[PDB]
């Protein structure tokens, strides 16, 4: 399975992830490639933010779907 991550700025990137694998795994890959903490980055889809502890299967995400990237604003 493959999915494209779209950054708020405007950049889509291919990202292969097993349906069984939870979101946490996806964030891990994103961190290694892009270099951004999982907690910091937040994905959005179907009017719902993806939780870092749920299998993609439940979400029933379409093949090669685009995920909206949203970086949490610093508390300071």
């Amino acid at each position: 399975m493959q999915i494209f991550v779209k950054t708020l700025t405007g950049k889509t990137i291919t990202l292969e992830v097993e349906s069984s694998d939870t979101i946490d795994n996806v964030k891990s890959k994103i961190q290694d490639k892009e270099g951004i903490p999982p907690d910091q980055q937040r994905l959005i889809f179907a009017g719902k933010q993806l939780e870092d502890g749920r299998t993609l299967s439940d979400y029933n995400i379409q093949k090669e779907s685009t995920l909206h990237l949203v970086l949490r604003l610093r508390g300071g």
């Binding site: 959005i44 889809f45 179907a46 719902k48 379409q62 909206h68 949203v70 970086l71 604003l73």
Partner: peptide
């Protein structure tokens, strides 16, 4: 509003919903 992060999150929420109009 001093919550650019929150608005941004929903902004993306609406944008995505528009595309996934056909329940996908």
């Amino acid at each position: 509003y001093p919550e650019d992060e929150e608005e941004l999150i929903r902004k993306a929420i609406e944008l995505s919903l528009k595309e996934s109009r056909n329940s996908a």
